Design a protein around this nucleic acid. Structure first.
Lengths: 97, 75, 685, 52, 138, 116, 71, 109
RNA sequence: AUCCUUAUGCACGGGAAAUACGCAUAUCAGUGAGGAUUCGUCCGAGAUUGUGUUUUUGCUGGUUUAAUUAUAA
C-alpha cells in the first residue's frame, strides 16, 4: 500500500525513488526491518515534521499530510496490525460503519 | 518437391502462416547467399557511384517495378 | 457520452477503389431510426438488479458448496464458470490466487476513504478495491457499439488521412503513443517554455490524422487560401495543420511528384510507339509553376498519328463500350492534375470531368488539339482517374499503367513515408534490436545465450552420375545450437525416417526445430538456461514463441549477420556422427576444443567464425590449409588440429586471406579497396 | 600544446571486445590477442620495475 | 519601477534600440495615468533582473516622447514592443495583431516564456516567433 | 517492475516467508490484467490451426490447440476439438480429455471405459 | 617561440618546478633553511624529497625571494 | 540569479561503459517502450490503477501472450532499479543496527 | 636479518557513485559542532551562511580525380 501510488508512474521524481527504494529494501530484508519497527514502537517518541498541502474539491478545501517515508512504514505496518487484531476480537460492533 | 540448382540441398526459409498452402523449394545454401550478395553488392557499388559522381537516375515506374520483380525432384 | 446527439446522415458515406473501378457507398438513402451515439446509460446495471443477483448468486453458491461438500468435494471451477461477473463480492474474488493473504487484510474500506488525506491524486473510485470486490462494470461492449454505430471502421477511416499512407489494409500496424515521445523528451534538460512546447505535438499528430474532415467547406465555411507553393486550401488557419502540412511538402515536393508521374507516362508510351503506331510523343515544356496553378491549365504530353485516330465520346477509365466511329483525328495530349481532397469531395471522377469538360471547352486553357485525356490524382486518398477521348489500346494499357504506377513512383512513395511519419504510424515487424556489427560486441556480455540453426535440418543432396542423373537422397539433418561461452553445442539430428510420412515439410520442419529448442532449454537447469536465444532465420520467431511461452524471461533475437554455422557440417567428426545417425538424438561437442585454456572466449569465437566463414567458401581448398601440416594430432576429444599460438597466428592469417581473395573475386571488388570495417563486415554480413 | 604524446586507450581483456581502435579487432583474432596481452604485461612489469 | 530605467527622448529610444548588442529590447509605451501602465509596469518590474542576461526593459510614456506614435501606430494605453538588433520582432499571439503587444499578461512564468521565446527566435533571424500561449480572447 | 499486471500476492508471500524465517534460523491469471481481445483470440486460433495442419496426427499439436485455446475460453469449442483429433494409442490424449469433457460419473466412465 | 614557452613557464606547476631545481638536496641544509624560514621542521610523515618540495611550495606561495635572500 | 541564456548547445557525446550504466537510469527502457506502441484498430490491454483508472500497457505483451494472459517476464533491467540517496542510506542502516542491539539486550536478558 | 601493525605517499588490479561534490580571507566550533534517552544520563566533530556544477570533466569515435603536347598543309 505504499507501492501503489506508483504502479502507473513512468517517471519517478526524486522523493519518490527514495521511497520506492525503502519499500523495496524492507520488502527484501524483512526480518531486519521488522526489528526496526518493533524498536520504533517500543521507544521512539520524536518525529520529523510533517508537511501540509491542501487538496481541493473546488468547494471544500481539504488538508493533506505527508510524512517521512520511514515513519510511514512503521505506521502502515502498525495500522495494518490494529485493524487485523481489532477485527479478530470483534471490537467494533455493527453500527460503526 | 520443387528444386532450384555431390551437392546437398536444404529447405528455403518460409513463414508458417504466410506460406500456408504453397509450393516449397529446395535451394543450395551457398547459392542463396551467393545470389543475394551479388545483387546487394551491385546495389552498393551503384550507391557509391551515384552519390560520389552526383548523377541522377532515370528509373521511375517501369524500372522500380522491375526491381520489385527481383525443376521438380522425386526423393 | 451521456447526451442525445446523433449522426448526421451525410457522414456515413464512404468509398473504395477496385482495380475494376471505383465503388461508392452511402447507407443514408434508406431512412430508419436515425443513428445515435450510444450513451452510457444502457451499459450499466441498476443497483437493484445487481443486489438481487447478489442474493441469488450467493445462494446457489453456498448450496452448491454444500453439494461438493456432500461429496466431500470442493467446488469445481466448472459450475461457477456459469456466472462469474455477478454478485457484489462477485466471484472471481473467491478464485483470486492471493485470497489467503487478503483475509488478513481488514478495514480496507475505511482506509480507501481516508486516502484523501495522505496524498494528493483524486481517487475517483474510493468505494472499492478491485482486489476485494472484483470489478464492478464492463464498458467493453461500448467500444464496439460506438464503432458499429458509426458505420464500421472503414466508414471512419474515410474520415482520416489513413488512405494517404496507403497501407492496403490496416491489420498489421501499430500506433505510437505520443506520451512516450513526450516523456522520452522530458528526461532532457528543458526550459519551462521548451516544456510547454511538448504539450502540442500530440495534438499535431491528431489534427493531421483527422485533417480531411476537420478541413472542409461544411465545417469552417470562411474563405479559402492556398498553402504557399502547393495545391491545398485551408478553410481556416488551423495553425497546427498548416505547419505540419508544410513539413509534409518541402523541397517543393508537390511538383516533383507531378513531374515524376508525367515522366513515367512518357516512359510508357515511349515504349508503345509500335503498338499504336504513334509517330511520336513529347513531354512538353511546362510553366514551372503549373503543377499547382488551379484556375488555368495547359497540356502536357503530345501524341501523333501514323494516319489518324478514331476518338470517342470522352469516357472513364473503367467504362467499356466505345464509339470510335464518333470521330477520327490526329494528335493527342494528356494532363496530369493533382487535387488533395477532402471528405467533402474525395471522388475524383467528377473532379476530372469537371476539369475536362471545363478546360477543354474553356477559352484560356490551352490544349493544342481538343483531343486528349485528363489524368487526375488524389494525393489524400490515393485515387486516380482519367476521363479521356479514346482509342484501341489505351484503357487496356493505361489502366495497367496507373496500377503499376501507384505502386511505384518514388514521389508518391515519398508522401506515404513523409506523412506516415507525421502521424507516426508504423508497420509492425519486430521491435527487438538485432545483432549488427555495431551491436556485435555485446555477444560476449554475461548473459547465457544460444545460437540456433535450421539450415541443414532437412537435406536431400544431389550428385551427378553416368546414367540417369542427379543422385539425390534425404539425409539425417542437424539442429545446430551452441553457447559461444562454454562452447557446448547441442545437435538434435532428425533422422530421415521421421520425414517420410509427411508433406509440405517447410512448416513442419520449423516446428520440429522450435520444439527441439523448447525441450532443449528444458534440458537445462534454469541456472544454465539462457536469456538471448539468437535465431538465424527470421521465420523462427513465431514457432519458438508458442513453445517458449512458458519461459517469459527468455528473449529471442534474429540478426542481420549471416552466420556460417552450417558449414560446420563440413567437419569430419560432425558429419560422422550425423551421417551415421540411425535415430534422432542429441550429441554434445565443444567446438572450441580447448581454446579456452589457451585464450579467452572472445578470440576463441572469432577464429571459429573464421574457420566457418571460410568453410563456406574455399571449403576443401581451405581444408588443405587446415591439413597442410601432417605432424599435428586431431584427438577423439578435440576437433580442430592443436597448434602453438604462433601456428594459429599463421593459420588465421591464411584463412583471413582466403575469404578476402575469393570474395573480391566473385564480387570483383579488389581486396585493396576495403575498410577495416568493410572487411570484417564481409567476414560477418 | 602538443609537447607530450597524445594518450591511448588502455585495453584489457574485458575491454578488448569493445575497442574500436582500428587494429585487427576481428581480422587478426590472435595477433590482436597478442598486442593486448603484452600490453597488460608491459604495464604490470613497469609497476614491478619502478618499485625496484 | 525604480529598477526599470526610463527614456526621456526619441534620441534615447533609438540609441537604446541600436545600442543593445546581444540581447532583446523591451519597451512599454504607456501613459503613467493609465491603469495597466501601472500593472504591466509591475509585472515587468519583477522580471527585470531575472532576465537581465538576454533582454532589457525600458519604460517610455507616449506623453514624454510621442514621436513614434505615428510611425508605430500607437493606440491603447499600453503596448509593449520588442526589438533585437534594430529589427521589429514579430510574434503572432493569435490575438490578431502579430506586431507589438497590447493586453496584460497575468503570469510571471508566462511573461518569461514570451521574452525568452521571442528571444530564441530572434537569435536565428526568424521574423515570426509563435507564442507559447494563444490568449486571443483578449 | 512497476508494470502493474505482473503482481499477485500469494506467491510473493510464500517466497518472502521463506526468506524471513530462513534468515532468522540462520541467525540462531491475475484479475488486474484485462481479458483477451477478440481478434487476438482469433489469431491464436489461426496459428494453432496452422500448427495443427502441420501434422494431423502427432496429437501434441492438437493438444496445444486444446490446452492453449482451452486456457482462454474452452467452452464447447475445446471439447469438440479434442473429440475430433482423438480420431488413440497414447494414454495422454485420454488423460487430458478425461479430465476435461467428463463432468459426470456416467460420461466420466465412458471416457474411462472406451479408454480401457 | 615566445607565448608558448611563456604560458608553459607561466603555468603554476612548472613555475614552481624551476624554483625546486636550484635548492640543495640534503636533510640538513634544507631542513635548516626551513627552520630559518620559521616553518615546522618536519611534517608528520615525509621522506626527504617531499620535504624539498614542501619548501618549494612555501617559497612560491608566500612569494619569497630566493634562498640566498632567505639567508 | 539570472536565467542563463535560452540558447541550445552542441551536444557533448561521451559514452563510456561507466557513463552508460549511469545513463540507463534516465532513458526509457525497452519494455517501457513496448508500452507505448498502441496496436492499431484493436483495443488495448489495460489494467486498473490503484485508483482503478486504466493504465494502458499497449504492446508490452506480444499478442500471443494476451490470449493466455501470460503477462511478461521478458527483460527486467537492473540498471534503473531505484536506490537510496547517500544520506538516507546511513540513517537506515544506522537505525537498523541500533535497534538490533536494543533487541539483543532483549536477547540475553 | 625476517614479519606484523599503523598512518601517509607512488602505484597496480578490481568494484561503486556521479542528489554528488565542491568552494569561501565566510562565520563560528573541544574554551563543545551537534545530537539522545530507559530522563539517571549518554554520545563528541562539524554546522551555519553564501555560492558553483551537478542527464556531467577532457579526448576520440559512425550516418543527413593532377599537366601536356605531337601531324603531311
Amino acid at each position: 500500500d505504499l507501492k501503489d501510488v506508483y504502479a502507473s508512474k513512468v517517471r519517478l521524481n526524486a522523493s519518490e525513488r527514495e521511497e520506492l527504494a525503502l519499500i523495496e529494501e524492507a520488502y527484501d530484508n524483512p526480518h531486519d526491518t521488522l526489528n526496526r519497527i518493533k524498536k520504533y514502537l517500543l521507544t521512539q517518541r520524536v518525529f520529523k515534521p510533517v508537511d501540509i498541502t491542501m487538496m481541493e474539491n473546488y468547494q471544500n478545501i481539504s488538508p493533506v499530510y505527508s510524512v517521512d517515508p520511514l515513519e510511514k512504514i512503521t505506521d502502515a505496518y502498525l495500522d495494518q496490525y490494529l485493524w487485523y487484531e481489532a477485527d479478530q476480537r470483534k471490537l467494533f460492533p455493527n453500527w460503526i460503519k | 518437391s520443387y528444386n532450384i540448382e555431390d551437392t546437398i540441398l536444404t529447405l528455403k526459409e518460409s513463414s508458417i502462416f504466410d506460406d500456408t498452402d504453397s509450393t516449397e523449394v529446395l535451394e543450395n545454401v551457398k547459392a542463396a547467399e551467393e545470389n543475394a550478395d551479388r545483387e546487394k553488392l551491385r546495389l552498393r557499388q551503384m550507391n557509391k557511384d551515384r552519390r560520389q559522381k552526383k548523377k541522377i537516375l532515370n528509373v521511375s515506374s517501369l524500372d522500380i517495378e522491375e526491381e520489385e520483380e527481383g525443376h521438380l525432384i522425386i526423393g | 457520452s451521456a447526451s442525445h446527439i446523433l449522426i448526421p446522415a451525410s457522414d456515413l458515406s464512404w468509398s473504395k477503389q477496385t482495380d475494376t473501378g471505383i465503388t461508392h457507398f452511402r447507407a443514408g438513402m434508406t431512412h430508419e431510426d436515425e443513428k445515435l451515439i450510444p450513451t452510457i446509460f444502457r451499459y450499466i446495471t441498476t443497483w437493484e438488479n445487481e443486489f438481487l443477483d447478489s442474493q441469488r448468486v450467493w445462494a446457489e453458491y453456498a448450496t452448491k458448496r454444500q453439494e461438493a461438500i456432500q461429496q466431500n468435494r470442493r467446488l469445481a471451477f466448472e459450475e461457477l464458470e456459469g456466472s462469474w461477473d455477478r454478485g457484489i463480492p462477485r466471484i472471481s474474488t473467491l478464485f483470486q490466487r492471493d485470497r489467503h493473504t487478503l483475509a488478513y487484510d481488514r478495514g480496507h474500506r475505511i482506509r480507501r476513504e481516508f486516502k484523501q488525506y495522505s496524498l494528493e491524486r483524486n481517487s475517483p473510485f474510493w468505494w472499492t478495491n478491485s482486489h476485494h470486490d472484483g470489478k464492478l462494470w464492463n464498458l467493453n461492449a461500448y467500444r464496439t457499439d460506438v464503432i458499429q454505430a458509426l458505420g464500421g471502421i472503414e466508414t471512419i477511416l474515410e474520415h482520416t488521412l489513413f488512405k494517404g499512407t496507403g497501407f492496403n489494409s490496416w491489420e498489421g500496424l501499430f500506433w505510437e503513443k505520443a506520451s512516450g515521445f513526450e516523456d522520452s523528451m522530458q528526461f532532457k534538460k528543458l526550459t519551462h517554455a521548451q516544456r510547454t512546447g511538448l504539450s502540442q505535438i500530440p495534438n499535431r499528430r491528431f489534427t493531421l490524422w483527422w485533417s480531411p474532415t476537420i478541413n472542409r467547406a461544411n465545417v469552417y465555411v470562411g474563405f479559402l487560401v492556398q498553402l504557399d507553393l502547393t495545391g491545398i486550401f485551408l478553410h481556416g488557419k488551423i495553425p497546427t495543420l498548416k505547419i505540419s502540412l508544410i513539413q509534409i511538402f518541402r523541397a517543393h515536393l508537390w511538383q516533383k511528384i507531378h513531374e515524376s508521374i508525367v515522366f513515367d507516362i512518357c516512359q510508357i508510351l515511349d515504349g508503345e510507339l509500335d503498338v499504336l503506331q504513334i509517330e511520336s510523343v513529347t513531354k512538353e515544356t511546362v510553366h514551372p509553376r503549373k503543377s499547382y496553378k488551379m484556375n488555368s491549365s495547359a497540356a502536357d504530353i503530345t501524341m501523333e498519328s501514323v494516319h489518324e485516330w478514331e476518338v470517342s465520346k470522352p469516357s472513364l477509365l473503367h467504362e467499356t463500350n466505345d464509339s470510335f466511329k464518333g470521330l477520327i483525328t490526329n494528335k493527342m495530349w494528356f494532363d496530369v492534375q493533382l487535387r488533395y481532397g477532402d471528405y467533402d469531395s474525395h471522388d475524383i471522377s467528377r473532379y476530372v470531368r469537371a476539369k475536362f469538360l471545363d478546360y477543354t471547352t474553356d477559352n484560356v486553357s490551352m490544349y493544342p488539339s481538343p483531343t486528349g485525356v485528363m489524368i487526375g490524382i488524389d494525393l489524400a486518398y490515393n485515387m486516380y482517374d482519367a476521363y479521356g477521348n479514346w482509342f484501341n489500346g489505351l484503357k487496356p494499357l493505361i489502366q495497367n499503367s496507373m496500377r503499376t504506377i501507384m505502386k511505384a513512383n518514388p514521389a508518391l512513395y515519398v508522401l506515404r513515408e513523409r506523412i506516415r511519419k507525421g502521424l507516426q504510424i508504423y508497420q509492425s515487424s519486430v521491435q527487438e534490436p538485432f545483432l549488427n556489427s555495431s551491436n556485435y560486441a555485446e555477444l560476449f556480455n554475461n548473459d547465457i545465450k544460444l545460437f540456433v540453426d535450421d539450415t541443414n535440418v532437412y537435406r536431400v543432396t544431389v550428385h551427378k552420375t553416368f546414367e540417369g542423373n542427379v543422385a539425390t537422397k534425404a539425409i539425417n539433418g542437424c539442429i545446430f545450437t551452441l553457447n559461444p561461452k562454454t562452447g557446448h553445442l547441442f545437435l538434435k539430428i532428425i533422422h530421415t525416417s521421421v520425414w517420410a510420412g509427411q508433406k509440405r515439410l517447410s512448416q513442419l520442419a520449423k516446428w520440429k526445430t522450435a520444439e527441439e529448442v523448447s525441450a532443449l532449454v528444458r534440458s537445462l537447469p534454469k541456472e544454465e538456461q539462457p536469456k538471448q536465444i539468437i535465431v538465424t532465420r527470421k521465420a523462427m520467431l513465431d514457432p519458438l514463441e508458442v513453445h517458449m511461452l512458458d519461459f517469459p524471461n527468455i528473449a529471442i533475437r534474429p540478426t542481420e549477420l549471416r552466420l556460417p554455422f552450417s558449414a560446420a557440417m563440413s567437419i569430419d567428426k560432425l558429419s560422422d556422427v550425423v551421417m551415421k545417425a540411425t535415430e534422432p538424438q542429441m550429441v554434445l561437442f565443444n567446438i572450441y576444443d580447448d581454446w579456452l585454456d589457451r585464450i579467452s572466449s572472445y578470440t576463441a569465437f572469432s577464429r571459429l567464425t573464421l574457420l566457418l566463414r571460410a568453410l563456406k567458401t574455399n571449403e576443401e581448398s581451405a581444408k588443405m590449409i587446415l591439413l597442410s601440416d601432417p605432424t599435428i594430432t586431431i584427438k577423439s576429444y578435440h576437433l580442430w588440429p592443436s597448434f602453438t599460438d604462433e601456428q594459429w597466428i599463421t593459420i588465421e592469417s591464411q584463412m583471413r586471406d582466403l575469404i578476402l581473395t575469393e570474395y573480391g573475386r566473385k564480387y570483383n571488388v579488389n581486396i585493396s579497396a576495403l575498410t577495416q570495417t568493410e572487411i570484417k563486415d564481409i567476414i560477418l554480413g | 600544446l602538443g609537447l607530450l604524446p597524445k594518450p591511448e586507450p588502455k585495453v584489457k581483456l574485458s575491454n578488448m571486445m569493445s575497442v574500436f581502435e582500428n587494429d585487427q579487432n576481428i581480422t587478426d583474432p590472435t595477433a590482436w590477442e597478442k598486442v593486448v596481452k603484452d600490453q597488460v604485461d608491459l604495464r604490470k612489469r613497469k609497476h614491478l620495475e619502478e618499485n625496484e | 519601477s525604480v529598477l526599470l530605467p526610463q527614456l526621456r527622448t526619441g534620441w534615447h529610444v533609438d540609441q537604446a534600440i541600436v545600442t543593445e548588442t546581444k540581447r532583446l529590447v523591451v519597451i512599454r509605451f504607456g501613459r503613467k495615468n493609465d491603469r495597466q501602465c501601472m500593472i504591466m509596469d509591475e509585472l515587468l518590474s519583477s522580471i527585470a533582473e531575472r532576465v537581465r542576461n538576454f533582454a532589457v526593459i525600458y519604460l517610455c510614456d507616449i506623453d514624454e516622447v510621442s514621436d513614434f506614435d505615428e510611425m508605430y501606430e500607437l493606440t491603447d494605453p499600453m503596448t509593449v514592443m520588442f526589438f533585437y538588433h534594430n529589427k521589429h520582432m514579430m510574434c503572432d499571439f493569435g490575438t490578431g495583431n502579430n506586431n507589438k503587444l497590447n493586453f496584460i499578461v497575468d503570469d510571471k512564468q508566462e511573461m518569461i516564456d514570451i521574452l525568452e521565446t521571442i528571444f530564441r527566435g530572434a537569435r536565428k533571424n526568424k521574423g515570426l516567433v509563435v507564442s507559447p500561449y494563444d490568449y486571443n480572447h483578449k | 517492475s512497476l508494470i502493474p499486471g505482473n503482481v499477485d500476492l500469494n506467491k510473493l508471500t510464500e517466497e518472502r516467508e521463506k526468506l524471513l524465517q530462513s534468515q532468522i534460523d540462520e541467525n540462531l491469471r491475475v484479475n488486474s490484467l484485462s481479458d483477451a481481445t477478440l481478434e487476438d483470440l482469433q489469431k491464436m486460433r489461426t496459428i494453432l490451426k496452422s500448427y495443427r495442419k502441420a501434422d494431423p496426427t502427432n496429437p501434441q499439436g492438437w493438444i496445444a490447440s486444446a490446452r492453449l485455446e482451452e486456457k482462454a475460453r474452452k467452452f464447447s469449442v475445446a471439447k469438440k476439438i479434442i473429440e475430433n483429433g482423438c480420431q488413440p494409442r497414447s494414454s495422454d490424449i485420454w488423460l487430458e480429455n478425461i479430465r476435461l469433457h467428463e463432468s459426470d460419473v456416467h460420461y466420466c466412465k465412458t471416457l474411462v471405459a472406451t479408454a480401457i | 617561440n615566445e607565448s608558448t614557452a611563456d604560458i608553459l613557464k607561466q603555468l603554476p606547476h612548472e613555475r614552481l618546478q624551476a624554483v625546486l631545481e636550484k635548492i640543495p638536496e640534503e636533510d640538513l641544509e634544507v631542513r635548516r633553511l626551513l627552520s630559518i624560514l620559521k616553518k615546522p621542521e618536519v611534517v608528520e610523515n615525509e621522506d626527504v624529497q617531499q620535504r624539498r618540495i614542501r619548501l618549494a611550495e612555501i617559497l612560491m606561495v608566500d612569494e619569497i625571494d630566493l634562498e640566498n635572500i632567505n639567508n | 540569479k539570472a536565467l542563463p541564456i535560452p540558447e541550445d548547445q552542441p551536444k557533448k557525446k561521451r559514452a563510456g561503459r561507466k557513463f552508460r550504466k549511469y545513463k540507463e537510469k534516465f532513458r526509457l527502457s525497452h519494455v517501457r517502450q513496448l508500452q507505448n506502441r498502441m496496436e492499431f484498430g484493436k483495443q488495448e490491454q489495460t489494467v486498473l490503477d490503484s485508483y482503478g483508472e486504466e493504465v494502458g500497457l499497449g504492446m508490452s505483451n506480444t499478442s500471443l501472450q494476451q490470449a493466455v494472459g501470460a503477462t511478461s517476464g521478458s527483460r527486467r533491467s537492473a540498471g534503473n532499479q531505484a536506490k537510496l540517496t547517500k544520506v538516507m542510506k546511513h540513517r537506515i542502516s544506522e537505525a537498523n543496527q541500533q535497534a538490533d542491539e536494543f533487541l539483543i539486550s532483549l536477547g540475553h536478558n
